């Protein structure tokens, strides 16, 4: 009766692994930071100096 | 106070008021504005008597 109970065991092994990747692979996604555009330059009111 | 000023379709005016502006020494002077995008505009005002 080896055959019988040996492919239980490798069935279930099999799930538990997948939706372990599952779990895994969604974390993964949606972490990813990014960035920012900066806006337009800035527009220059004034330059000047003083001692 | 607010920080941004609109107005419409039909005339305005301006009315700006600096203490340190002297009719006696100064032949003229010169108004800016600036946009809310960025862009601006220029218009120049005698000031001399006449």
Known sequence: ????IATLLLILIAVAAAVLLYTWVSGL???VAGTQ?????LTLIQATWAR | IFDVA????????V????????PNVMQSVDVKMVFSDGSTW???VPLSIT
């Not at chain 1, 009766?1 to 019988?4: A, G, I, K, L, N």
């Not at chain 2, 009315?15 to 002297?22: D, H, K, L, Q, R």
């Open chain 1, 1 to 4: 009766v080896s055959p019988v």
């Open chain 1, 29 to 31: 996604s949606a972490n």
């Open chain 2, 15 to 22: 009315v700006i008021w600096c203490p340190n502006v002297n």
């Open chain 2, 6 to 13: 609109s107005a419409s379709q039909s005339n305005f005016a």
């Open chain 2, 42 to 44: 220029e218009a120049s």
């Open chain 1, 37 to 41: 555009v900066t806006g337009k330059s």
